[PDB]
């Protein structure tokens with residue numbers, strides 16, 4: 001079963017949290033530093049910007065490659081794509097190889113949305129960039145850009161399987177951001193500023 005095989009492969013590949021991998025092989029436990037997350041932001045806090053951008057690239061590929069196989073092999077309207085993108089995001093969030101504690105799924109979801117539509121991923125990235133340049137909170141930018149990815153796919157008239165994939169990935173990412181959210185509502189969320197400019 002090529003479809004079921006590809007969903008399983010998206011989940012197993014997504015389970016490779018490269019922030020955990022690169023941090024542990026660099027000698028660091030990400031759960032202790034920063035937000036406790038295993039993604040590019042916390043990897044940047046823990047190991048510098050070089051390793052964060054690499055882990056972002058890898059977690060992005062985790063979602064891009066299986067979703068691209070799904071779109072090319074079954075079509076943009078196939079539910080194999082829905083379950084492939086969901087499998088990558090869930091594999092990144094609940095990794096089978098790392099005790100089912102992983103990240104919040106933003107980079108991988110960006111891979112999925114890029115395989116679906118590079119232009120939607122472009123404008124969603126522009127949303128993220130605007131929010132981060134404006135308010136200097138990574139999480140706020142990620143939440144807004146996720147919701148906006150759904151909004152763009154909706155306004156473009158993308159099929160129902162893709163809109164459902166986006167609704168579920170988005171709800172997943174927000175839920176995984178709940179603690180960032182209450183940190184934002186409490187004034188205790190990390191704000192990037194000239195301290196990182198000087199010492200990152």
Ligand SMILES: CCCCCCCC/C=C\CCCCCCCC(=O)OC[C@H](O)CO
Pocket residue numbers: 003004007078079080083086168
């Ligand atoms: C938890 C977050 C929300 C999750 C929301 C959905 C949950 C569904 C659960 C299990 C079935 C999915 C497993 C899919 C297995 C492969 C799918 C497949 O084979 O699709 C081919 C199909 O014939 C094309 O029409």
Ligand SMILES: CCCCCCCC/C=C\CCCCCCCC(=O)OC[C@H](O)CO
Pocket residue numbers: 090094096175
């Ligand atoms: C080995 C099997 C691998 C197969 C795939 C394994 C991962 C699927 C597990 C959970 C999906 C999570 C979906 C969201 C969970 C619900 C969150 C929630 O509602 O939390 C409770 C409460 O609301 C708090 O206030």
Ligand SMILES: CCCCCCCC/C=C\CCCCCCCC(=O)OC[C@H](O)CO
Pocket residue numbers: 040041044049052053056106107109110112113124125128138142145146149150165166167169170192200
């Ligand atoms: C179908 C649903 C899909 C939803 C898709 C949402 C798309 C959001 C777009 C881009 C996020 C990019 C975020 C990462 C950018 C760089 C992160 C990073 O490393 O930042 C740390 C620090 O800023 C370094 O100094």
Ligand SMILES: CCCCCCCC/C=C\CCCCCCCC(=O)OC[C@H](O)CO
Pocket residue numbers: 167170171172174175178
């Ligand atoms: C036709 C479609 C109908 C459905 C459309 C749904 C749209 C998404 C709605 C809400 C955001 C999802 C996540 C919201 C946050 C839930 C998790 C949270 O923060 O809960 C507190 C925490 O779990 C501690 O208890």
Ligand SMILES: O=P(O)(O)OC[C@H](O)CO
Pocket residue numbers: 034035036037039040041042104106107138139142180190
């Ligand atoms: O501030 P963090 O460490 O929770 O990161 C939020 C980002 O959306 C994770 O990529």
